[PDB]
Amino acid sequence: MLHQLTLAEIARALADKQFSAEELTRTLLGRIRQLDPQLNSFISITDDLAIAQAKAADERRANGENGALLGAPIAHKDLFCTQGVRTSCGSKMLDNFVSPYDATVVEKLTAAGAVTLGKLNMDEFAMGSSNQSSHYGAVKNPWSLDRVPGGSSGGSAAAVAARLLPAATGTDTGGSIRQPAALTNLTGIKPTYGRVSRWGMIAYASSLDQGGPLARTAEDCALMLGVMAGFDPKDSTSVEQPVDDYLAALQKPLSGLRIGLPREYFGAGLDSRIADAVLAVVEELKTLGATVKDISLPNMQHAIPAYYVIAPAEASSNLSRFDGVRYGYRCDAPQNLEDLYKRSRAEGFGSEVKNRIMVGTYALSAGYYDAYYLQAQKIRRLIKNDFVSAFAEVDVILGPTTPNPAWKIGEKNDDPVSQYLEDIYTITANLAGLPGLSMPAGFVDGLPVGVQLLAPYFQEGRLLNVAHQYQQVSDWHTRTPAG
Amino acid sequence: MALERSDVEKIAHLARLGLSEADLPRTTETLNNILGLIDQMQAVDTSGVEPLAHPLEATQRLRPDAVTETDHRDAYQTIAPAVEEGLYLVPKVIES
Amino acid sequence: WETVIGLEIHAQLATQSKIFSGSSTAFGAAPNTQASLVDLAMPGTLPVLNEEAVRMACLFGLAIDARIDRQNVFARKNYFYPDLPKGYQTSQMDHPIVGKGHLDITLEDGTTKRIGITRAHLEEDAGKSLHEDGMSGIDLNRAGTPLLEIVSEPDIRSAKEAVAYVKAIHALVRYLGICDGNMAEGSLRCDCNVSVRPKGQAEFGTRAEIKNVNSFRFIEKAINHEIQRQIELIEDGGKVVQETRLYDPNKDETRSMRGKEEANDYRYFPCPDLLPVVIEPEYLAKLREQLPELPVQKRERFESQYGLSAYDASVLS
């Protein structure tokens, strides 16, 4: 009966003096450890720190200080470093690594008054969109135990959707939040590059990585984003901006709001079912009182290769520090120094990460640099130009998220062609560094599909605003009892 | 656009990778597929336009010469596999 | 014979906190005591550029009369070595802090010649290995220390000219208060790219890079003993190969540290975590007013306006 959780209703209930955070966390944990092995969404569950944090949440709740969300149960990704907890990113390499320092996001959230339960499974260093390459095991979808929840934040989406947790923290590198949210009927929001700090957050692609919240309702992820945003002097990529009043931005009408529907979002790759699922949403948005105009993106199709030139390259440098001299996992038989490097990096992770690092190194190699890396960056520039040219008349650009419904496990996991042909629409925002939001449109063959909306720089309040206005039309709340 | 086993070999030497005889063909194939995917962008002209390294056009990044407190010995070695008198033990000879 | 040499000078800036870390610089025998969270290259950690570091950098840029660029980006020098914590050395390949300057070097026998400096960017130091006990121990006490890599134009010729250039760099930097200058403590270091060629033929005469040269005497002796060596090598013909040699003052002989099998691909590219720092002409406007009087011109000013001899004016300056 405590499965219907949401941070708003939970704050309202805790304000009503129903019980302590400890009862909530103990019951919820009880629900966790019982049904978890069926989906394997969690890797480690710290009980001592959880119950301690819960008692501290109680003593803090006593004087009702410092927060909109008090004693709220939230979990974190294996990417974010945590004091005492084994940060591993879900890999054999970074296994047995207890970080001596926390993370800006975990520190801020805990200081705000949020109890951390534990860490959920994720892809190896945010590489892959299937969560099948996980060393700890493939994650199963709550709607279909035979299919995938997504990637590279499949574990969070699967955890929240399967009634385990009200809200979680996800990552955005190349469409690693919108896809799992869409496959699990969730609302995932990605802030502008520079909003959420990256200190403590282990990088896969520095110029693409950005941490964002993942929850059930737009209001919830708004409550999270309102906290997890802001500048951090320890991080160089962080930008100073004072707009952080997302919670109040709600209930603003869509009176005469221009909406862009791109032609390139309607191609040969997406099925007609999701297309109708999108057009229904567009018509419903017209009923909400918004206007729709056709927009164009000449360099939207060219978004797929460039990404897989930029993201691996940086990674090939970013993962160069992982040698096993200072931390992580070290070779059992290190004959040489070169042998130490090669063997340690060999027994890190299998084919996916290794091969992507290979393509990255090939891209950064002398000679191929101007033809590949520089090319991809200039294409990225053209994409940014297309976006800033398009948003001159259009306020928000909407379209379909995933082009194909969920695919089963044991199929084209070895084959990367289908893996790359999945993320086509979602990467443009990442390359442009624009704020995005995925909200579920409906269901296809019993499987959930979502719609992605993109907004201009430093105004996520508007996207979550239209999100909230969208929350008024059709709600899918009564979905928790089934799974 | 094309690759041999030695190209993959030198790439492996650059990024430091352990590769066996059995893993070679599949890696070459997948890599060739990836290159086959990225090669499509070469058709588009990129004259005059400038590259984009960072999404936001930010400026100066200064940090004052302020000294921060230093941690103790014990916090480092807890994760370190090799330790001697507070130093990391590593093989010296580097060949092949 | 024509001896065309070059000089790659590393100067250790005297700043309290490290260029990207927060640990102190000056320190004694205590190992690993100057390594915080940043220097250990922990996963998820990020670097932040030092203020007085770049300040002293563009200060040296202004002192050397070089056109300072409006924007400069730090690049990555990816190489794998136990002294280097991360997988890349944060240096500057394209768009350095300082570029194209000139220094008036004081020689003997009449004319005081001017020498060119192609660049002067910001680099980073690595760990230190010592012979013990078996295996080895790496100390990151000096790791993370801000470095200034002054690369000189190959306009420098004779060995005595080279010693004069090193002395001039040392003096100017000492006056600027950028580095301590004490080579004994290991603050100021340099390398020499010496290459000779017979006059008339642009042919023959492979380049020889002698690394780790301490005192001025060591510089002179090593450069000479390398010049004559190359001369002999070209006279005999044999095999002129590119290698990175070193010099020991005990036997005055040139030793080969590493055999260069092929051109090392460090894979340079703009660092994605660090954004390009923009130095406006106002910065330079304030620093130019902050600029101290140069010793080379101050001793000559001690000759001109105030009645004094060359010797006493120089030793006074």
JSON list of N, CA and C in Angstrom, two decimals, chain B residues 25-69:
[
{"chain": "B", "resi": 25, "resn": "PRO", "atom": "N", "xyz": [39.41, -11.44, -35.16]},
{"chain": "B", "resi": 25, "resn": "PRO", "atom": "CA", "xyz": [38.53, -11.29, -36.34]},
{"chain": "B", "resi": 25, "resn": "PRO", "atom": "C", "xyz": [37.25, -10.51, -36.05]},
{"chain": "B", "resi": 26, "resn": "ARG", "atom": "N", "xyz": [36.58, -10.86, -34.95]},
{"chain": "B", "resi": 26, "resn": "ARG", "atom": "CA", "xyz": [35.34, -10.20, -34.56]},
{"chain": "B", "resi": 26, "resn": "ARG", "atom": "C", "xyz": [35.55, -8.71, -34.32]},
{"chain": "B", "resi": 27, "resn": "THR", "atom": "N", "xyz": [36.64, -8.37, -33.64]},
{"chain": "B", "resi": 27, "resn": "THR", "atom": "CA", "xyz": [36.97, -6.97, -33.38]},
{"chain": "B", "resi": 27, "resn": "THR", "atom": "C", "xyz": [37.21, -6.21, -34.68]},
{"chain": "B", "resi": 28, "resn": "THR", "atom": "N", "xyz": [37.96, -6.82, -35.60]},
{"chain": "B", "resi": 28, "resn": "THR", "atom": "CA", "xyz": [38.21, -6.21, -36.90]},
{"chain": "B", "resi": 28, "resn": "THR", "atom": "C", "xyz": [36.90, -5.97, -37.66]},
{"chain": "B", "resi": 29, "resn": "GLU", "atom": "N", "xyz": [36.02, -6.96, -37.62]},
{"chain": "B", "resi": 29, "resn": "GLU", "atom": "CA", "xyz": [34.72, -6.87, -38.29]},
{"chain": "B", "resi": 29, "resn": "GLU", "atom": "C", "xyz": [33.86, -5.74, -37.73]},
{"chain": "B", "resi": 30, "resn": "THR", "atom": "N", "xyz": [33.68, -5.74, -36.42]},
{"chain": "B", "resi": 30, "resn": "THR", "atom": "CA", "xyz": [32.87, -4.72, -35.75]},
{"chain": "B", "resi": 30, "resn": "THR", "atom": "C", "xyz": [33.44, -3.32, -35.98]},
{"chain": "B", "resi": 31, "resn": "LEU", "atom": "N", "xyz": [34.76, -3.20, -35.84]},
{"chain": "B", "resi": 31, "resn": "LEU", "atom": "CA", "xyz": [35.44, -1.93, -36.07]},
{"chain": "B", "resi": 31, "resn": "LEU", "atom": "C", "xyz": [35.21, -1.45, -37.50]},
{"chain": "B", "resi": 32, "resn": "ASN", "atom": "N", "xyz": [35.32, -2.37, -38.46]},
{"chain": "B", "resi": 32, "resn": "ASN", "atom": "CA", "xyz": [35.10, -2.04, -39.86]},
{"chain": "B", "resi": 32, "resn": "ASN", "atom": "C", "xyz": [33.66, -1.59, -40.11]},
{"chain": "B", "resi": 33, "resn": "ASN", "atom": "N", "xyz": [32.72, -2.17, -39.37]},
{"chain": "B", "resi": 33, "resn": "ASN", "atom": "CA", "xyz": [31.33, -1.76, -39.45]},
{"chain": "B", "resi": 33, "resn": "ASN", "atom": "C", "xyz": [31.15, -0.34, -38.92]},
{"chain": "B", "resi": 34, "resn": "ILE", "atom": "N", "xyz": [31.80, -0.05, -37.80]},
{"chain": "B", "resi": 34, "resn": "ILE", "atom": "CA", "xyz": [31.74, 1.27, -37.18]},
{"chain": "B", "resi": 34, "resn": "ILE", "atom": "C", "xyz": [32.31, 2.34, -38.10]},
{"chain": "B", "resi": 35, "resn": "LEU", "atom": "N", "xyz": [33.48, 2.06, -38.67]},
{"chain": "B", "resi": 35, "resn": "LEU", "atom": "CA", "xyz": [34.12, 2.97, -39.61]},
{"chain": "B", "resi": 35, "resn": "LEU", "atom": "C", "xyz": [33.23, 3.14, -40.83]},
{"chain": "B", "resi": 36, "resn": "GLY", "atom": "N", "xyz": [32.57, 2.05, -41.23]},
{"chain": "B", "resi": 36, "resn": "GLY", "atom": "CA", "xyz": [31.63, 2.07, -42.33]},
{"chain": "B", "resi": 36, "resn": "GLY", "atom": "C", "xyz": [30.43, 2.95, -42.03]},
{"chain": "B", "resi": 37, "resn": "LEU", "atom": "N", "xyz": [30.11, 3.10, -40.75]},
{"chain": "B", "resi": 37, "resn": "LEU", "atom": "CA", "xyz": [29.02, 3.97, -40.34]},
{"chain": "B", "resi": 37, "resn": "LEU", "atom": "C", "xyz": [29.45, 5.44, -40.31]},
{"chain": "B", "resi": 38, "resn": "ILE", "atom": "N", "xyz": [30.62, 5.70, -39.75]},
{"chain": "B", "resi": 38, "resn": "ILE", "atom": "CA", "xyz": [31.08, 7.08, -39.61]},
{"chain": "B", "resi": 38, "resn": "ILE", "atom": "C", "xyz": [31.46, 7.70, -40.96]},
{"chain": "B", "resi": 39, "resn": "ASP", "atom": "N", "xyz": [31.89, 6.87, -41.91]},
{"chain": "B", "resi": 39, "resn": "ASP", "atom": "CA", "xyz": [32.38, 7.35, -43.20]},
{"chain": "B", "resi": 39, "resn": "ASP", "atom": "C", "xyz": [31.36, 8.16, -44.02]},
{"chain": "B", "resi": 40, "resn": "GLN", "atom": "N", "xyz": [30.09, 8.11, -43.64]},
{"chain": "B", "resi": 40, "resn": "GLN", "atom": "CA", "xyz": [29.04, 8.81, -44.38]},
{"chain": "B", "resi": 40, "resn": "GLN", "atom": "C", "xyz": [29.16, 10.33, -44.32]},
{"chain": "B", "resi": 41, "resn": "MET", "atom": "N", "xyz": [29.77, 10.83, -43.26]},
{"chain": "B", "resi": 41, "resn": "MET", "atom": "CA", "xyz": [29.87, 12.27, -43.03]},
{"chain": "B", "resi": 41, "resn": "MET", "atom": "C", "xyz": [30.83, 12.97, -44.00]},
{"chain": "B", "resi": 42, "resn": "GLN", "atom": "N", "xyz": [31.72, 12.19, -44.61]},
{"chain": "B", "resi": 42, "resn": "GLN", "atom": "CA", "xyz": [32.74, 12.74, -45.51]},
{"chain": "B", "resi": 42, "resn": "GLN", "atom": "C", "xyz": [32.13, 13.39, -46.75]},
{"chain": "B", "resi": 43, "resn": "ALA", "atom": "N", "xyz": [30.90, 13.00, -47.07]},
{"chain": "B", "resi": 43, "resn": "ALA", "atom": "CA", "xyz": [30.21, 13.53, -48.24]},
{"chain": "B", "resi": 43, "resn": "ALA", "atom": "C", "xyz": [29.87, 15.01, -48.08]},
{"chain": "B", "resi": 44, "resn": "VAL", "atom": "N", "xyz": [29.61, 15.42, -46.85]},
{"chain": "B", "resi": 44, "resn": "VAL", "atom": "CA", "xyz": [29.24, 16.81, -46.56]},
{"chain": "B", "resi": 44, "resn": "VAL", "atom": "C", "xyz": [30.46, 17.73, -46.54]},
{"chain": "B", "resi": 45, "resn": "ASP", "atom": "N", "xyz": [30.34, 18.88, -47.20]},
{"chain": "B", "resi": 45, "resn": "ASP", "atom": "CA", "xyz": [31.42, 19.86, -47.24]},
{"chain": "B", "resi": 45, "resn": "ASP", "atom": "C", "xyz": [31.52, 20.61, -45.92]},
{"chain": "B", "resi": 46, "resn": "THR", "atom": "N", "xyz": [32.74, 20.82, -45.45]},
{"chain": "B", "resi": 46, "resn": "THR", "atom": "CA", "xyz": [32.95, 21.51, -44.18]},
{"chain": "B", "resi": 46, "resn": "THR", "atom": "C", "xyz": [33.91, 22.70, -44.30]},
{"chain": "B", "resi": 47, "resn": "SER", "atom": "N", "xyz": [33.88, 23.37, -45.45]},
{"chain": "B", "resi": 47, "resn": "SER", "atom": "CA", "xyz": [34.75, 24.51, -45.69]},
{"chain": "B", "resi": 47, "resn": "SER", "atom": "C", "xyz": [34.28, 25.76, -44.95]},
{"chain": "B", "resi": 48, "resn": "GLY", "atom": "N", "xyz": [35.23, 26.52, -44.41]},
{"chain": "B", "resi": 48, "resn": "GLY", "atom": "CA", "xyz": [34.93, 27.77, -43.74]},
{"chain": "B", "resi": 48, "resn": "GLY", "atom": "C", "xyz": [34.46, 27.64, -42.30]},
{"chain": "B", "resi": 49, "resn": "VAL", "atom": "N", "xyz": [33.56, 26.69, -42.05]},
{"chain": "B", "resi": 49, "resn": "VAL", "atom": "CA", "xyz": [32.98, 26.51, -40.72]},
{"chain": "B", "resi": 49, "resn": "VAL", "atom": "C", "xyz": [34.02, 26.09, -39.69]},
{"chain": "B", "resi": 50, "resn": "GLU", "atom": "N", "xyz": [33.78, 26.47, -38.44]},
{"chain": "B", "resi": 50, "resn": "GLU", "atom": "CA", "xyz": [34.69, 26.17, -37.34]},
{"chain": "B", "resi": 50, "resn": "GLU", "atom": "C", "xyz": [34.18, 25.00, -36.49]},
{"chain": "B", "resi": 51, "resn": "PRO", "atom": "N", "xyz": [35.10, 24.30, -35.81]},
{"chain": "B", "resi": 51, "resn": "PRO", "atom": "CA", "xyz": [34.72, 23.17, -34.94]},
{"chain": "B", "resi": 51, "resn": "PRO", "atom": "C", "xyz": [34.04, 23.61, -33.64]},
{"chain": "B", "resi": 52, "resn": "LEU", "atom": "N", "xyz": [33.33, 22.68, -33.01]},
{"chain": "B", "resi": 52, "resn": "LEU", "atom": "CA", "xyz": [32.66, 22.96, -31.74]},
{"chain": "B", "resi": 52, "resn": "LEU", "atom": "C", "xyz": [33.13, 21.98, -30.67]},
{"chain": "B", "resi": 53, "resn": "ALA", "atom": "N", "xyz": [34.03, 22.43, -29.80]},
{"chain": "B", "resi": 53, "resn": "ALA", "atom": "CA", "xyz": [34.58, 21.58, -28.75]},
{"chain": "B", "resi": 53, "resn": "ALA", "atom": "C", "xyz": [33.70, 21.58, -27.51]},
{"chain": "B", "resi": 54, "resn": "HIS", "atom": "N", "xyz": [33.15, 22.74, -27.18]},
{"chain": "B", "resi": 54, "resn": "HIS", "atom": "CA", "xyz": [32.30, 22.88, -26.00]},
{"chain": "B", "resi": 54, "resn": "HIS", "atom": "C", "xyz": [30.97, 23.52, -26.35]},
{"chain": "B", "resi": 55, "resn": "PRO", "atom": "N", "xyz": [29.87, 22.92, -25.86]},
{"chain": "B", "resi": 55, "resn": "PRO", "atom": "CA", "xyz": [28.49, 23.36, -26.14]},
{"chain": "B", "resi": 55, "resn": "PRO", "atom": "C", "xyz": [28.25, 24.83, -25.80]},
{"chain": "B", "resi": 56, "resn": "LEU", "atom": "N", "xyz": [28.81, 25.30, -24.69]},
{"chain": "B", "resi": 56, "resn": "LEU", "atom": "CA", "xyz": [28.62, 26.68, -24.27]},
{"chain": "B", "resi": 56, "resn": "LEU", "atom": "C", "xyz": [29.86, 27.53, -24.49]},
{"chain": "B", "resi": 57, "resn": "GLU", "atom": "N", "xyz": [29.64, 28.77, -24.92]},
{"chain": "B", "resi": 57, "resn": "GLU", "atom": "CA", "xyz": [30.70, 29.72, -25.22]},
{"chain": "B", "resi": 57, "resn": "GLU", "atom": "C", "xyz": [31.16, 30.44, -23.95]},
{"chain": "B", "resi": 58, "resn": "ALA", "atom": "N", "xyz": [31.80, 29.70, -23.05]},
{"chain": "B", "resi": 58, "resn": "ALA", "atom": "CA", "xyz": [32.28, 30.27, -21.80]},
{"chain": "B", "resi": 58, "resn": "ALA", "atom": "C", "xyz": [33.68, 30.87, -21.94]},
{"chain": "B", "resi": 59, "resn": "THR", "atom": "N", "xyz": [34.06, 31.68, -20.95]},
{"chain": "B", "resi": 59, "resn": "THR", "atom": "CA", "xyz": [35.29, 32.45, -21.00]},
{"chain": "B", "resi": 59, "resn": "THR", "atom": "C", "xyz": [36.33, 32.00, -19.97]},
{"chain": "B", "resi": 60, "resn": "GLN", "atom": "N", "xyz": [36.93, 32.98, -19.29]},
{"chain": "B", "resi": 60, "resn": "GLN", "atom": "CA", "xyz": [38.03, 32.76, -18.36]},
{"chain": "B", "resi": 60, "resn": "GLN", "atom": "C", "xyz": [37.72, 31.73, -17.27]},
{"chain": "B", "resi": 61, "resn": "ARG", "atom": "N", "xyz": [38.76, 31.02, -16.83]},
{"chain": "B", "resi": 61, "resn": "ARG", "atom": "CA", "xyz": [38.60, 30.06, -15.74]},
{"chain": "B", "resi": 61, "resn": "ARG", "atom": "C", "xyz": [39.74, 30.20, -14.73]},
{"chain": "B", "resi": 62, "resn": "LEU", "atom": "N", "xyz": [39.56, 31.08, -13.75]},
{"chain": "B", "resi": 62, "resn": "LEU", "atom": "CA", "xyz": [40.62, 31.34, -12.78]},
{"chain": "B", "resi": 62, "resn": "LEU", "atom": "C", "xyz": [40.38, 30.68, -11.42]},
{"chain": "B", "resi": 63, "resn": "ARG", "atom": "N", "xyz": [41.46, 30.29, -10.75]},
{"chain": "B", "resi": 63, "resn": "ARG", "atom": "CA", "xyz": [41.38, 29.82, -9.37]},
{"chain": "B", "resi": 63, "resn": "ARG", "atom": "C", "xyz": [42.49, 30.51, -8.58]},
{"chain": "B", "resi": 64, "resn": "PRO", "atom": "N", "xyz": [42.13, 31.18, -7.47]},
{"chain": "B", "resi": 64, "resn": "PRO", "atom": "CA", "xyz": [43.14, 31.87, -6.66]},
{"chain": "B", "resi": 64, "resn": "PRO", "atom": "C", "xyz": [44.18, 30.91, -6.09]},
{"chain": "B", "resi": 65, "resn": "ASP", "atom": "N", "xyz": [45.37, 31.43, -5.77]},
{"chain": "B", "resi": 65, "resn": "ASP", "atom": "CA", "xyz": [46.45, 30.60, -5.25]},
{"chain": "B", "resi": 65, "resn": "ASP", "atom": "C", "xyz": [46.20, 30.25, -3.78]},
{"chain": "B", "resi": 66, "resn": "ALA", "atom": "N", "xyz": [45.04, 29.65, -3.52]},
{"chain": "B", "resi": 66, "resn": "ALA", "atom": "CA", "xyz": [44.64, 29.29, -2.17]},
{"chain": "B", "resi": 66, "resn": "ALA", "atom": "C", "xyz": [44.99, 27.84, -1.87]},
{"chain": "B", "resi": 67, "resn": "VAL", "atom": "N", "xyz": [45.71, 27.63, -0.77]},
{"chain": "B", "resi": 67, "resn": "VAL", "atom": "CA", "xyz": [46.12, 26.28, -0.39]},
{"chain": "B", "resi": 67, "resn": "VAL", "atom": "C", "xyz": [45.03, 25.59, 0.43]},
{"chain": "B", "resi": 68, "resn": "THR", "atom": "N", "xyz": [44.74, 24.35, 0.05]},
{"chain": "B", "resi": 68, "resn": "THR", "atom": "CA", "xyz": [43.72, 23.54, 0.71]},
{"chain": "B", "resi": 68, "resn": "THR", "atom": "C", "xyz": [44.39, 22.49, 1.59]},
{"chain": "B", "resi": 69, "resn": "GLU", "atom": "N", "xyz": [43.75, 22.15, 2.70]},
{"chain": "B", "resi": 69, "resn": "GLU", "atom": "CA", "xyz": [44.31, 21.22, 3.68]},
{"chain": "B", "resi": 69, "resn": "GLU", "atom": "C", "xyz": [44.67, 19.88, 3.04]}
]
